[PDB]
Symmetry: D2
Subunit: 473 residues, 4 copies
């Protein structure tokens, strides 16, 4: 049971319009919207969306496995060994938000301060004392972006596992010699950095020149969650405000995906005429190039929606019915919708490119979709006994000799393994991950899906407790 099984299960249910039914459906943790900073929904005047993994939630593990298979086949195509074709995607290994150390070829799970929580070389999990040889302070410099790459997105899940697969394969294949910073093959030396770049280039290629999009759109039921409540919720948003789309994807792909998402024999509610997906948006913008979008952006272009090509030249005209934009900047949206930043609730899945950047650069209000939360919540509530025991051990030790520390490490591991080999997205034991810290800092609201907004009235006041400093308590 993957997180997308949970979402597609909730998606299959009819949308009860009764006001008591929505407020009661809101009880389950799975249907809740979580609040890091208070937000008065009545002040929101524009609802903004990205598409991928927000409106178009790709089914797991089928879509990761497709991306993994095409990336492997691209690497074999450029000259990697045929043994790569015997890899098979394993959804139990990767957790999102890991850091690949391109110097030593390690996947690292770190906290907000660069402290090491988990270190794996290939499929070998390196224990505390052994990591100190490569990480003397059990710490990485996050600003060393040439060395460390943060695997922020769900699109990065196939390459997260692929990187570990490759390190494992070259380590144990007799043809190659293992060195500290790569692998030697006779007169050829492949550094982990160059291998990582090949992987990155191949993932990009699969998405932009390969067949991933084509294979997705030829079997949309297999790869994309479809929910009749999505048109309903978007129609409610457009009744109280303006609605816009700003996606990094191109128009031809967006049109195919969005058409599928809205292909029901009715409009927002059963019995209503079907409307085209574009009619749900006051402003549609593709090729957004986020996060650069939230700074200078790019030249504003207009899409010829008949051919799917860009019209030649910079678009200098006004917002018109049926126009589709390409490129531009976040200021394009604000000017054309007559919005200020805090009037906008932007719903995205990219913690860095959508949420952090719109918050810091423009002061937009933010809603982070976290697809895996649909299943991490289930693990969290089911295995809560282990966390409560861990909390007790931390408290008992905080007042105590060392037989407790071995029990702390033991329960930490058992808790983490319920999530997978790389543990929870949000923590390792009692230590929070970098990802959790960035969710708390930059996502005003968050949920497994933005559809959970259906269960709250549009006057709702999302409330978070005020923060106090230690000396103020």
């Amino acid at each position: 049971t993957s997180w997308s099984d949970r979402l597609q299960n909730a998606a299959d249910m009819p949308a009860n319009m009764d006001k008591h039914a929505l407020k009661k459906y809101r009880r389950e943790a799975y249907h809740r919207v979580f609040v890091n900073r208070s937000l008065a929904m009545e002040k929101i005047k524009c609802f903004g969306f990205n598409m991928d993994y927000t409106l178009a939630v790709y089914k797991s593990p089928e879509y990761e496995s497709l991306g993994f298979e095409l990336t492997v086949e691209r690497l074999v195509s450029i000259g990697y060994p045929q043994e790569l074709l015997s890899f098979a995607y394993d959804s139990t290994f990767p957790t999102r938000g890991l850091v690949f150390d391109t110097l030593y070829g390690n996947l690292l799970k770190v906290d907000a301060y660069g402290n090491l929580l988990v270190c794996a070389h290939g499929f070998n999990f390196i224990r505390g004392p052994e990591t100190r040889e490569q990480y003397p302070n059990k710490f990485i410099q996050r600003d060393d972006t040439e060395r460390f790459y943060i695997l922020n997105t769900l699109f990065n899940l196939p390459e997260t596992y692929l990187l570990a697969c490759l390190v494992d394969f070259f380590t144990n294949c007799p043809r190659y010699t293992s060195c500290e910073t790569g692998f030697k093959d006779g007169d050829l030396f492949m550094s982990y950095r160059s291998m990582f770049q090949d992987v990155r280039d191949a993932v990009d290629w699969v998405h932009y020149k390969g067949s991933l999009k084509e294979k997705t759109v030829e079997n949309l039921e297999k790869y994309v969650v479809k929910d009749g409540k999505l048109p309903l919720l978007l129609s409610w948003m457009k009744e109280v405000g303006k609605v816009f789309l700003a996606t990094n994807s191109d128009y031809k792909y967006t049109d195919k995906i969005m058409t599928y998402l809205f292909d029901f024999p009715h409009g927002p509610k059963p019995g209503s005429s079907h409307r085209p997906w574009q009619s749900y948006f006051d402003l549609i913008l593709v090729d957004a190039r986020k996060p650069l979008f939230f700074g200078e952006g790019t030249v504003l272009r207009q899409v010829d929606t008949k051919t799917g090509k860009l019209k030649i030249g910079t678009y200098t005209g006004p917002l018109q019915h049926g126009i589709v934009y390409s490129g531009g900047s976040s200021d394009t949206i604000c000017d054309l919708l007559g919005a200020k930043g805090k009037d906008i609730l932007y719903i995205g899945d990219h913690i860095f490119g959508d949420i952090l950047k719109s918050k810091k650069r423009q002061g937009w209000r933010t809603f982070l979709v976290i697809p895996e939360l649909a299943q991490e919540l289930h693990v969290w509530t089911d295995k809560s006994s282990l966390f409560e025991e861990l909390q007790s051990l931390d408290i008992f030790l905080a007042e105590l000799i060392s037989s407790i520390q071995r029990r702390i490490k033991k329960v930490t591991h058992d808790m983490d393994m319920c999530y997978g080999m790389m543990g929870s997205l949000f923590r390792s034991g009692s230590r929070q991950t970098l990802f959790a810290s960035q969710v708390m800092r930059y996502a005003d609201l968050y949920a497994a899906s933005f559809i959970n907004l259906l269960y709250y009235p549009f006057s709702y006041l999302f409330r978070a407790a005020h923060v106090l400093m230690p000396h103020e308590s």
Copy 2:
């Protein structure tokens, strides 16, 4: 009663060595060490210090007023009008951590997200609706470091007030025309940006080429807090670990100041022989050039302590008794003391250049000295009734029509004015400042003075509660 009066009051008392006396003296909020993240003191192997406003705490408002007077006289010297000499430093106006907007000439107090809490043009405090003309989203882009300058340090307090003085003077002087981005004087236009640069250059000049240091060292009793407990605490640190000094100041000034700080007719305790200040340090490093120090740093030099000049060449030798270093990098300290980052507790007063940077770049443990906390604590506990009323108003409104909002704004202002015209260092009403957020994020421990460590045993476990995400609660 300034914050330095509080510190000098506590400094004048004898250090009772009784173990029950120290743990009981620790009760008062003023003698406490506050904890943002848990820290086991037994793991600390090196105690590091800066000098200015940490070991050498400059008396307020005398030192700010001296800096203000010399900066004004430098500006008049380069051609600013004689009316500047009628300014007089006013300690009730500036709060530390304000942002000067060089485009519009405003002092801004902002939260961690760039939201405006206070805006003053000269001495005119701009009310909410009027700020929207210049700040349409009541928000500044903090990454626009060419436009916004954060006045982080206590050394910036004179220029904080001076900037407001200058804007006020040119606005109301009939010879000048007020424009949006500066002042016009016939065929001369002085932008707020160029005026700000003149101020910055003059403050730098006063510290590095003018007479500020000379005037300080010729009346040390007037300008520098002296505490007999400082040699005592440093001697205890050197009994359990190593102690180092890394100051941005030069050796000749450091030697004069430190000699004064240790000039008592005894050593650590009354009855003991006096020891030179240098004997309290395993490593002394001047001209540190923090924060660059925590990256590549500069070439490591050796001070000729007889002449006070640098020896010619890069120092390639080892740590030796009596050597004094200049420049280098944080790695110099780690290598020479055989320390890893988390072995080091670095005690500093510069939230950015000492604390944020050593934490993020090197994973050092951090102790932030906040001199004004000695008096902000007194205001906080005395006027606690206003904050509790403010908390009630926020709760009552969070469940309610708009007669409460005017009461919220009214109590916010009355609370803030107890701290001064620019309010608390840490908040405006219920909203925390950028400075408060950076203290919580990067200072593991903090206190009005590091001397408060005297009241804790060196095995102490400083404890902070574990953080949970909203969905984990």
Copy 3:
């Protein structure tokens, strides 16, 4: 009769081995090697080559016209108007080395100092006084590389004409409004800068992703000069020194082209066994990425010559028979051949990327191939009467009222038109072009083809007269 007709005519003749026959064949200006700086051939130990337009001389105007047609069809493919398909390449318009001014959409012919010699907007040649509106000092800043693009190569000849075609088309097409910096089409504004970028991108695309290479290799007789003297001369070079190839092209294309160039029923001389083209080289390097090659270069790779793919990893081994390199740097060649810069004569056609950069960065000796010289020489000797008259007019005026200036401008134009609409590669009248100045400064030797070296003994001392300053004469 194009310049490549001249070369292919000389190519069709048998190579007479008689030593008196070669030294006599050297009399014609067309078979000479011209000398800017003295060069003793006996000191040359390595002969280096690029491939395109040096070993593989593409026939004119067929190859330019092919490149023009595919670039036009790529622009139409991305959305440019169908009228582009009615353009047809005209070899009489473009001269190499022109500067496209992306601000005003002009093709400029300039001297070494940025002075304007010719200015054309579309097909309209702007006369002296009219250029002063856009060029007040009849001068461009050559360091403004964001505004001015120098069309250095023969590959740039199709886009030189295409840029003029496009400016002409949009100017005179009623659907578009002509503005100073581009063309307006309703709500779309296309700047000359964005149009220029589209052209550049399309030319790149045609060469790297389109069908230009495929169409060339499917009709090599139509597109590539073939000379039996090329294997002969290369074999003589390998008898006295080492021979290397460093091409920006990839191995699969290089192999196809070079195989064709060496496909004769014999080896160097008639009657000898045929040898593969690779056997003529001590070192073969593709994907050179010149001019970056002459600085840090790129990682050194090894080509799998069976598949045409790069082997995975950096090549760390030695120079071996049959190895083919990819990337690397000029230091790769020097180290592997045991050469110093002045031991190397590098034969190239790119005045900037081959000749200027190897000379300035590495002190290599240089031989510039200038394909058009084969025909510019014929025009120069035939129409010499006009130049001599021009020289007389300059002398007579230099001692004289203004009826001479109109005659000077008149003869200048008549002389220039013999070369084409944009005049000689090397001058406009008595003023030398930027290109001529860079040939003189950075090409030690030059010729229409490097095959002219066949007519000189390998002990030859190429001689240039010593330069004196004015005060030394």
Copy 4:
């Protein structure tokens, strides 16, 4: 007899106004203006000047020796050894335009292509074969500006000799160990790069914070050439055009120097009323910051000529009588004088900062003053027999075994030594220097002094022969 003795000798003579007297005085090579590119003086509408070493020609070797002594005393002041005080400036060693290699501590004389002509380590002149260890291709990369510093100016002559003095001193002083890249002194290593930086910093300090200016202005007869013909020539220029001053020096120094230069008991001619120096200029601009001046420049300021301080603010007004500008850009001059680049003859002594940059960035006409030419001409004409013999040897060898090469090297050295230990500014034997090449390329006119313009009518056509390519001859 120094070059400034020649200039001061010519300066002491009365200015005969007879038109035949001026055209006859023009015969001597010493009074001629030399021409690299033709220039019609009637087209010049503005005459521009720098001050230092153009209007204010500092006497040699007294001024170099003063600069040397103060720089040495500054280095001793910061901690260099006392033995430096026994150095004494030697005008026979330095030639202008040498390159200090900061890696190996060598002074290099190079040609325009980076080829080594002379190499000296300290006072040891390294012979051809021995230089190949450090310079394998007898070549330096001029674009490696972090390694190589070109000593372009007459102000650099003291540090040219000082650098050789220091290398010589540390090499032969027993306390220091000689390494390839510097000197070791126990645990201190001083690289040639850091030593070079100390020298550079000290020269800057002497000019901007030390006593060099003060000592110059207290003995102007000792240090500055004074010529009654200078006011005369400037008055003739102002009769036919506009005259401007753009100096890097500050106003207080400029005023002192210019007052001295114009302090005669008469105006332009004997018998005329004296006029203040400022009245000879249509535009006076100080603090020019050339060469940045010829790009974006700096903010335009106005000097308060009463106090010598800058007025506060950017000057936005027009050109007015008596105004003195500070900063700005070359566009300031063009706009205020209504000039285009080719209307301007700019007379400067800095081959890079005045001449190269105004020519390339702005297309100004250029006149380079070369003070040493006053004496290099005398050596050139006196020792012409050696050069003619050298030319014969080159011709005889160019048609010849190796007994001639030793004679070529022998005569080259004897010729060079007549100029000094580092040879002619313009050549070593038959090889031209980088400096000579840049004079020819960027100086339209040149002379030992701009005063030589007095001997030419303002309608004069300076003529240079047209350049032909080898294939055009």
